Amino acid sequence: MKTYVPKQVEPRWVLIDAEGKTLGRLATKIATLLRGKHRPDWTPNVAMGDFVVVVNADKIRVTGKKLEQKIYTRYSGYPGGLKKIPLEKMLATHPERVLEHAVKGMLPKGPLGRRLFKRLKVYAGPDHPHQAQRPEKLEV
Amino acid sequence: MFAIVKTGGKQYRVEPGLKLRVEKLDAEPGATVELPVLLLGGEKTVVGTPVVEGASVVAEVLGHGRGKKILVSKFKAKVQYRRKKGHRQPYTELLIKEIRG
Amino acid sequence: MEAKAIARYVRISPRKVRLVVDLIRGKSLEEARNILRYTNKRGAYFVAKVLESAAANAVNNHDMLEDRLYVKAAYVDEGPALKRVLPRARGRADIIKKRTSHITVILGEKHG
Amino acid sequence: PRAKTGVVRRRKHKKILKLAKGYWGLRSKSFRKARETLFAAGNYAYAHRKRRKRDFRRLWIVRINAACRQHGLNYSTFIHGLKKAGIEVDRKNLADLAVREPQVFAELVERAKAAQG
Amino acid sequence: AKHPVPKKKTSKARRDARRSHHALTPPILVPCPECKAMKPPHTVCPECGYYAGRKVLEV
Amino acid sequence: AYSGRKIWPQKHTGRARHGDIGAPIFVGGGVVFGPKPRDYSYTLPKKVRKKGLAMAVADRAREGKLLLVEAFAGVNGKTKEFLAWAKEAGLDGSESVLLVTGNELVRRAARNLPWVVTLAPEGLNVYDIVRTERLVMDLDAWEVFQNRIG
RNA sequence: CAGGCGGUAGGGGAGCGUUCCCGAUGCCGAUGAAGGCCGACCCGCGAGGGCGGCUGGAGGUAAGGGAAGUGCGAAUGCCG
RNA sequence: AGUGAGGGCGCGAGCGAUAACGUCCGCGUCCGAGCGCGGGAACAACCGAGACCGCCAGCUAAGGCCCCCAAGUCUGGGCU
RNA sequence: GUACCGUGAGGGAAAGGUGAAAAGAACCCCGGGAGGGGAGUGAAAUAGAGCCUGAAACCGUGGGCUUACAAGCAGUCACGGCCCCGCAAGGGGUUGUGGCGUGCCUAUUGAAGCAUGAGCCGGCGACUCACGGUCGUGGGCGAGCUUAAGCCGUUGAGGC
Ligand SMILES: [Mg+2]
Ligand SMILES: [Mg+2]
Ligand SMILES: [Mg+2]
Ligand SMILES: [Mg+2]
Ligand SMILES: [Mg+2]
Ligand SMILES: [Mg+2]
Ligand SMILES: [Mg+2]
Ligand SMILES: [Mg+2]
Ligand SMILES: [Mg+2]
Ligand SMILES: [Mg+2]
Ligand SMILES: [Mg+2]
Ligand SMILES: [Mg+2]
Ligand SMILES: [Mg+2]
Ligand SMILES: [Mg+2]
Ligand SMILES: [Mg+2]
Ligand SMILES: [Mg+2]
Ligand SMILES: [Mg+2]
Ligand SMILES: [Mg+2]
Ligand SMILES: [Mg+2]
Ligand SMILES: [Mg+2]
Ligand SMILES: [Mg+2]
Ligand SMILES: [Mg+2]
Ligand SMILES: [Mg+2]
Ligand SMILES: [Mg+2]
Ligand SMILES: [Mg+2]
Ligand SMILES: [Mg+2]
Ligand SMILES: [Mg+2]
Ligand SMILES: [Mg+2]
Ligand SMILES: [Mg+2]
Ligand SMILES: [Mg+2]
Ligand SMILES: [Mg+2]
Ligand SMILES: [Mg+2]
Ligand SMILES: [Mg+2]
Ligand SMILES: [Mg+2]
Ligand SMILES: [Mg+2]
Ligand SMILES: [Mg+2]
Ligand SMILES: [Mg+2]
Ligand SMILES: [Mg+2]
Ligand SMILES: [Mg+2]
Ligand SMILES: [Mg+2]
Ligand SMILES: [Mg+2]
Ligand SMILES: [Mg+2]
Ligand SMILES: [Mg+2]
Ligand SMILES: [Mg+2]
Ligand SMILES: [Mg+2]
Ligand SMILES: [Mg+2]
Ligand SMILES: [Mg+2]
Ligand SMILES: [Mg+2]
Ligand SMILES: [Mg+2]
Ligand SMILES: [Mg+2]
Ligand SMILES: [Mg+2]
Ligand SMILES: [Mg+2]
Ligand SMILES: [Mg+2]
Ligand SMILES: [Mg+2]
Ligand SMILES: [Mg+2]
Ligand SMILES: [Mg+2]
Ligand SMILES: [Mg+2]
Ligand SMILES: [Mg+2]
Ligand SMILES: [Mg+2]
Ligand SMILES: [Mg+2]
Ligand SMILES: [Mg+2]
Ligand SMILES: [Mg+2]
Ligand SMILES: [Mg+2]
Ligand SMILES: [Mg+2]
Ligand SMILES: [Mg+2]
Ligand SMILES: [Mg+2]
Ligand SMILES: [Mg+2]
Ligand SMILES: [Mg+2]
Ligand SMILES: [Mg+2]
Ligand SMILES: [Mg+2]
Ligand SMILES: [Mg+2]
Ligand SMILES: [Mg+2]
Ligand SMILES: [Mg+2]
Ligand SMILES: [Mg+2]
Ligand SMILES: [Mg+2]
Ligand SMILES: [Mg+2]
Ligand SMILES: [Mg+2]
Ligand SMILES: [Mg+2]
Ligand SMILES: [Mg+2]
Ligand SMILES: [Mg+2]
Ligand SMILES: [Mg+2]
Ligand SMILES: [Mg+2]
Ligand SMILES: [Mg+2]
Ligand SMILES: [Mg+2]
Ligand SMILES: [Mg+2]
Ligand SMILES: [Mg+2]
Ligand SMILES: [Mg+2]
Ligand SMILES: [Mg+2]
Ligand SMILES: [Mg+2]
Ligand SMILES: [Mg+2]
Ligand SMILES: [Mg+2]
Ligand SMILES: [Mg+2]
Ligand SMILES: [Mg+2]
Ligand SMILES: [Mg+2]
Ligand SMILES: [Mg+2]
Ligand SMILES: [Mg+2]
Ligand SMILES: [Mg+2]
Ligand SMILES: [Mg+2]
Ligand SMILES: [Mg+2]
Ligand SMILES: [Mg+2]
Ligand SMILES: [Mg+2]
Ligand SMILES: [Mg+2]
Ligand SMILES: [Mg+2]
Ligand SMILES: [Mg+2]
Ligand SMILES: [Mg+2]
Ligand SMILES: [Mg+2]
Ligand SMILES: [Mg+2]
Ligand SMILES: [Mg+2]
Ligand SMILES: [Mg+2]
Ligand SMILES: [Mg+2]
Ligand SMILES: [Mg+2]
Ligand SMILES: [Mg+2]
Ligand SMILES: [Mg+2]
Ligand SMILES: [Mg+2]
Ligand SMILES: [Mg+2]
Ligand SMILES: [Mg+2]
Ligand SMILES: [Mg+2]
Ligand SMILES: [Mg+2]
Ligand SMILES: [Mg+2]
Ligand SMILES: [Mg+2]
Ligand SMILES: [Mg+2]
Ligand SMILES: [Mg+2]
Ligand SMILES: [Mg+2]
Ligand SMILES: [Mg+2]
Ligand SMILES: [Mg+2]
Ligand SMILES: [Mg+2]
Ligand SMILES: [Mg+2]
Ligand SMILES: [Mg+2]
Ligand SMILES: [Mg+2]
Ligand SMILES: [Mg+2]
Ligand SMILES: [Mg+2]
Ligand SMILES: [Mg+2]
Ligand SMILES: [Mg+2]
Ligand SMILES: [Mg+2]
Ligand SMILES: [Mg+2]
Ligand SMILES: [Mg+2]
Ligand SMILES: [Mg+2]
Ligand SMILES: [Mg+2]
Ligand SMILES: [Mg+2]
Ligand SMILES: [Mg+2]
Ligand SMILES: [Mg+2]
Ligand SMILES: [Mg+2]
Ligand SMILES: [Mg+2]
Ligand SMILES: [Mg+2]
Ligand SMILES: [Mg+2]
Ligand SMILES: [Mg+2]
Ligand SMILES: [Mg+2]
Ligand SMILES: [Mg+2]
Ligand SMILES: [Mg+2]
Ligand SMILES: [Mg+2]
Ligand SMILES: [Mg+2]
Ligand SMILES: [Mg+2]
Ligand SMILES: [Mg+2]
Ligand SMILES: [Mg+2]
Ligand SMILES: [Mg+2]
Ligand SMILES: [Mg+2]
Ligand SMILES: [Mg+2]
Ligand SMILES: [Mg+2]
Ligand SMILES: [Mg+2]
Ligand SMILES: [Mg+2]
Ligand SMILES: [Mg+2]
Ligand SMILES: [Mg+2]
Ligand SMILES: [Mg+2]
Ligand SMILES: [Mg+2]
Ligand SMILES: [Mg+2]
Ligand SMILES: [Mg+2]
Ligand SMILES: [Mg+2]
Ligand SMILES: [Mg+2]
Ligand SMILES: [Mg+2]
Ligand SMILES: [Mg+2]
Ligand SMILES: [Mg+2]
Ligand SMILES: [Mg+2]
Ligand SMILES: [Mg+2]
Ligand SMILES: [Mg+2]
Ligand SMILES: [Zn+2]
């Protein structure tokens, strides 16, 4: 008696509103969905997660002085090439990234994890363009 | 109707007519043996605590046999240590006849 | 039906001939003649001789018609190498391999 | 009497290259690289047979959990309720039920709930 | 100079990989307007000796 | 047969270190522990030798395959003559025979049979008796055997 | 039935295979020896041993014993 | 027979500078030979635990239960 | 005892195998030749002289699976896909994604080690033998056991 393995299956689009939610505690869940681990037929070597659409990302919330004090870095390969950006500034420019970035670092590394990351759809402001898939508004 | 049975220290979901390979039993081939039922599903739903009282699954032993050879090898480095063992796990094949209960 | 030809113990290095042979493989006997006619390599000579020897064998030996011939298969195999001593500075000596080839051409008919 | 090597060493060598079919480059063409690779392979099998067991328990657990939270309770307490109610159905089967027999899993949920408070 | 030297034999994969570009190009050719024999363009025909209508050299 | 020269200097060649090319490590070099002439013989206790010789005739006695004859009648020398006689002693040659006798002529007759092994009495030995199905002996030779042992 | 069974140096035990000897004036062999190449088959814990297909073309060596130039992956080993 | 280069850690001393992945002894332990398994990101010797083989069964240890990553975004009560 | 090396004394190789029989391939064809394609000989030419068998490294041609947003001691466990063998169920090949993953040897307190050895394959390659010891062991005889050289016999015979 072998374990059930699901056959290729229709995805499930979903909608999240990020206004007011705590950055970390939200993405911890967006990852959970993306990965698929809420479906009882879950399967680790295939992409069977949800598609997540997130809106009002620009209005995510953080505790503490993280607005000014938390610092997003990235290298550049050149000498002196380390760039360091305070959260304030990132929200000011590309607020989408803040959530994007937070969720990414919670997804598996490698081919599949990079594919699951593409199923995340983050927008600042209340409007998203995926009216076509009619995403089921999620609550938690 | 389906049954969750328990034999050879493991559990399997059976239906009548299921060909099942299991840990080696004593029955002569062609003998029929009763297997304890842990749960009955399908139309009824009877749930064992741990075992369902009246139930039983009648199965017939088709035959015994050795599984394919699993070659078990050991190797520690810089220490001249190698071992080759050839494991062929024994089993019993059952045809599931019916589900009493 | 197919017709074969093999020039062998040809004193040229295989990688070099094999370069030319790849030009004509799968080609028609007419492109092949044209291609080798103007391939700026030394190997062109030898592959050409085999390609012509095959075509002869095709019609003179195997009842096949010249207007339908094509290079169905062709290859070069390494032959025994002529080994040679090359004296280097400070007394050292090297071995030069003057390599050789076994050039094979296989022609078929096809009527498309 | 002289007992020259003869046929023996080839036969050993061929025996092992036979095993190493599929291996990459010299690991399938060189006896000495074949052997080395095989050493590893043997140990990976032995250790992975052990791991395979853990791996499936994890998989099953992840599913039983998912199925659980549909009925609004975690695997944590589900298992517990299933224990205090003397159920002995294992995870390999719990998980197959969670998928193939929703209505039965759903029942086992109510039972577990019942027998912990 | 201190005599640089290959640290490892090149693998068959990596050798042949390098030669992915070594492949030869078929001679580019055109038919002669006169004798219709194939020949390289912009060159005087070796078969009939004509170029640009005129007979250039005698074959 | 090689020289004793060190084929090349100990250091700074980049080759491995060597001595003469008669070193067993070279092809064509000497052999490490190859065979040299030998005496495989040894002096088995005389008492043992006798005791087994008697014991061999015993094994053949118990089997019944021992036969004593006082003389072979027809045999004047030729093989067919023995074949005649052998027929009568019931030696049809379906089984091997050790023929022990002092009689020069009789051994001559039986000799070329591929089922017969000829022997003088002095030559009795336990190998030859074991590797034959049947024992057949002169009374004149039995005397020798009885005398050896004792 | 009960218990034990990680293991370097090292000690002990039981086996596998190579060449040769007896077994042999035998038995197997052109209806194909040895050797080679395959195999998802059989037996063996394993070293191995069989069976089948292809090659090969003249040898082979049983049960039971005997004897050793008896098993290689490394020696900047030797030869090719 | 092998061993007669040991090492780390805890504890007790000498040397040292109440330095050293220091050194020298003593008691114990483990690595050595358990660079096999779980934890401690990674890590001989710290925590857990002494691997005969098989299983798509179960319980626990250390350590853990928000995501990467198995299990509580558990329940009270404080502090920052 | 040559080739070759060395002024010299001296050093010192490699190299055996068509087939029972040369019947050793006339003649035609391509080619300057070499070499091949027909033909012919033979049981066999996948015995064609660079000749019995013809392993491995190594080099090609053809086919199946696979690969151009994934970072790797090259494997392994699982699932899935394609191709193939299979009445069935089962299997072979390949590998997309997921899990796990510090070559072998030696020397070492300790090595994946940026310590040693190995380009790869094939073959040669190291605990022997004699005499004497000391234990164990299979036997023979036992207050006794046992012969050495040699002599006789044999010519794989033993006796004295
Ligand atoms: Mg879905
Ligand atoms: Mg839905
Ligand atoms: Mg708003
Ligand atoms: Mg700058
Ligand atoms: Mg800087
Ligand atoms: Mg900025
Ligand atoms: Mg990671
Ligand atoms: Mg995106
Ligand atoms: Mg908007
Ligand atoms: Mg909108
Ligand atoms: Mg928009
Ligand atoms: Mg939708
Ligand atoms: Mg049903
Ligand atoms: Mg079955
Ligand atoms: Mg009954
Ligand atoms: Mg089987
Ligand atoms: Mg099997
Ligand atoms: Mg170890
Ligand atoms: Mg074993
Ligand atoms: Mg090509
Ligand atoms: Mg043309
Ligand atoms: Mg120069
Ligand atoms: Mg050189
Ligand atoms: Mg070179
Ligand atoms: Mg050897
Ligand atoms: Mg492979
Ligand atoms: Mg295991
Ligand atoms: Mg694990
Ligand atoms: Mg377990
Ligand atoms: Mg409770
Ligand atoms: Mg290639
Ligand atoms: Mg180019
Ligand atoms: Mg024109
Ligand atoms: Mg032209
Ligand atoms: Mg000499
Ligand atoms: Mg000297
Ligand atoms: Mg030399
Ligand atoms: Mg030297
Ligand atoms: Mg050098
Ligand atoms: Mg050097
Ligand atoms: Mg050297
Ligand atoms: Mg030497
Ligand atoms: Mg030599
Ligand atoms: Mg010796
Ligand atoms: Mg001697
Ligand atoms: Mg003595
Ligand atoms: Mg004597
Ligand atoms: Mg006489
Ligand atoms: Mg005779
Ligand atoms: Mg005889
Ligand atoms: Mg005689
Ligand atoms: Mg005789
Ligand atoms: Mg005799
Ligand atoms: Mg054994
Ligand atoms: Mg014989
Ligand atoms: Mg014979
Ligand atoms: Mg004879
Ligand atoms: Mg026989
Ligand atoms: Mg014949
Ligand atoms: Mg036959
Ligand atoms: Mg045959
Ligand atoms: Mg092959
Ligand atoms: Mg088979
Ligand atoms: Mg078996
Ligand atoms: Mg045998
Ligand atoms: Mg067998
Ligand atoms: Mg044949
Ligand atoms: Mg054969
Ligand atoms: Mg012959
Ligand atoms: Mg034998
Ligand atoms: Mg036989
Ligand atoms: Mg035997
Ligand atoms: Mg034998
Ligand atoms: Mg014997
Ligand atoms: Mg034997
Ligand atoms: Mg030897
Ligand atoms: Mg070695
Ligand atoms: Mg070597
Ligand atoms: Mg070297
Ligand atoms: Mg050499
Ligand atoms: Mg060399
Ligand atoms: Mg050689
Ligand atoms: Mg060499
Ligand atoms: Mg000592
Ligand atoms: Mg001592
Ligand atoms: Mg000392
Ligand atoms: Mg030391
Ligand atoms: Mg110590
Ligand atoms: Mg200590
Ligand atoms: Mg410490
Ligand atoms: Mg301390
Ligand atoms: Mg102090
Ligand atoms: Mg101090
Ligand atoms: Mg201090
Ligand atoms: Mg300090
Ligand atoms: Mg201080
Ligand atoms: Mg200290
Ligand atoms: Mg101190
Ligand atoms: Mg201590
Ligand atoms: Mg450990
Ligand atoms: Mg220990
Ligand atoms: Mg280690
Ligand atoms: Mg550990
Ligand atoms: Mg760890
Ligand atoms: Mg740490
Ligand atoms: Mg370490
Ligand atoms: Mg440490
Ligand atoms: Mg570790
Ligand atoms: Mg360790
Ligand atoms: Mg701990
Ligand atoms: Mg503790
Ligand atoms: Mg317990
Ligand atoms: Mg537990
Ligand atoms: Mg504790
Ligand atoms: Mg705990
Ligand atoms: Mg955590
Ligand atoms: Mg984990
Ligand atoms: Mg989890
Ligand atoms: Mg010389
Ligand atoms: Mg001859
Ligand atoms: Mg001859
Ligand atoms: Mg010819
Ligand atoms: Mg001509
Ligand atoms: Mg000329
Ligand atoms: Mg012919
Ligand atoms: Mg013919
Ligand atoms: Mg024939
Ligand atoms: Mg043939
Ligand atoms: Mg000749
Ligand atoms: Mg000749
Ligand atoms: Mg020749
Ligand atoms: Mg020639
Ligand atoms: Mg040759
Ligand atoms: Mg050949
Ligand atoms: Mg094709
Ligand atoms: Mg290909
Ligand atoms: Mg990507
Ligand atoms: Mg993998
Ligand atoms: Mg899948
Ligand atoms: Mg396809
Ligand atoms: Mg296909
Ligand atoms: Mg197939
Ligand atoms: Mg079939
Ligand atoms: Mg079929
Ligand atoms: Mg299948
Ligand atoms: Mg497959
Ligand atoms: Mg793979
Ligand atoms: Mg597969
Ligand atoms: Mg990985
Ligand atoms: Mg390490
Ligand atoms: Mg080494
Ligand atoms: Mg280390
Ligand atoms: Mg190294
Ligand atoms: Mg270092
Ligand atoms: Mg160094
Ligand atoms: Mg050193
Ligand atoms: Mg070497
Ligand atoms: Mg080497
Ligand atoms: Mg090196
Ligand atoms: Mg080199
Ligand atoms: Mg040896
Ligand atoms: Mg010794
Ligand atoms: Mg010894
Ligand atoms: Mg020895
Ligand atoms: Mg001795
Ligand atoms: Mg003593
Ligand atoms: Mg003794
Ligand atoms: Mg005694
Ligand atoms: Mg003496
Ligand atoms: Mg005489
Ligand atoms: Mg004499
Ligand atoms: Mg003799
Ligand atoms: Mg003789
Ligand atoms: Mg004597
Ligand atoms: Zn023209």
Curated annotation (Swiss-Prot), chain B:
SUPFAM superfamilies with a match to the protein in the record: L21p-like
Keyword list, A-Z: Ribonucleoprotein, Ribosomal protein, RNA-binding, rRNA-binding
Assigned GO CC terms: cytoplasm; ribonucleoprotein complex; ribosome
Gene Ontology molecular function: any one: structural constituent of ribosome
GO annotation, biological process: translation
Pfam families: Ribosomal_L21p (PF00829)
Assembly mode: Part of the 50S ribosomal subunit. Contacts protein L20.
Role summary: This protein binds to 23S rRNA in the presence of protein L20.
Family: Belongs to the bacterial ribosomal protein bL21 family.
Protein name listed in UniProt: Large ribosomal subunit protein bL21
Gene assigned in the entry: rplU
UniProtKB/Swiss-Prot annotation, chain D:
Annotated GO CC locations: ribonucleoprotein complex; ribosome
Record organism: Thermus thermophilus (strain ATCC BAA-163 / DSM 7039 / HB27)
Alphabetic keyword roster: Ribonucleoprotein, Ribosomal protein, RNA-binding, rRNA-binding
Family designation: Belongs to the bacterial ribosomal protein bL20 family.
Pfam families hit by this protein: Ribosomal_L20
UniProt xrefs under InterPro entries: Ribosomal_bL20, RIBOSOMAL_L20_CS, Ribosomal_protein_bL20_C
Reported function: Binds directly to 23S ribosomal RNA and is necessary for the in vitro assembly process of the 50S ribosomal subunit. It is not involved in the protein synthesizing functions of that subunit.
Family matches, as SUPFAM superfamilies: Ribosomal protein L20
A Gene Ontology BP annotation from the UniProt entry: translation
Entry-linked PROSITE patterns: RIBOSOMAL_L20 (PS00937)
Coiled coil start-end: none
Protein name, per record: Large ribosomal subunit protein bL20
Gene Ontology molecular function: rRNA binding; structural constituent of ribosome
From Swiss-Prot, chain E:
Stretches with biased composition (Basic residues): 1-22
GO molecular function, one term: structural constituent of ribosome
Any single GO CC term annotated in Swiss-Prot or TrEMBL for this entry: large ribosomal subunit
Spans annotated as Disordered: 1-27
Gene3D superfamilies: Single helix bin
Gene Ontology BP term (one): translation
Keywords: Ribonucleoprotein, Ribosomal protein
Keyword Ribosomal protein belongs to the record: yes
Similarity field: Belongs to the bacterial ribosomal protein bL32 family.
Protein's name according to its UniProt entry: Large ribosomal subunit protein bL32
Source organism per UniProt: Thermus thermophilus (strain ATCC BAA-163 / DSM 7039 / HB27)
Originating gene: rpmF
From Swiss-Prot, chain F:
GO MF annotations in UniProt: rRNA binding; structural constituent of ribosome
A GO biological process held by the record: translation
Alphabetic keyword roster: Ribonucleoprotein, Ribosomal protein, RNA-binding, rRNA-binding
Coiled coil: none
GO cellular component, one term: ribonucleoprotein complex
Family indicated by similarity: Belongs to the universal ribosomal protein uL4 family.
Function text: One of the primary rRNA binding proteins, this protein initially binds near the 5'-end of the 23S rRNA. It is important during the early stages of 50S assembly. It makes multiple contacts with different domains of the 23S rRNA in the assembled 50S subunit and ribosome.
Oligomeric and partner information: Part of the 50S ribosomal subunit.
Protein name: Large ribosomal subunit protein uL4
Organism: Thermus thermophilus (strain ATCC BAA-163 / DSM 7039 / HB27)
Residues of the full protein shown: 53 to 202 of 205
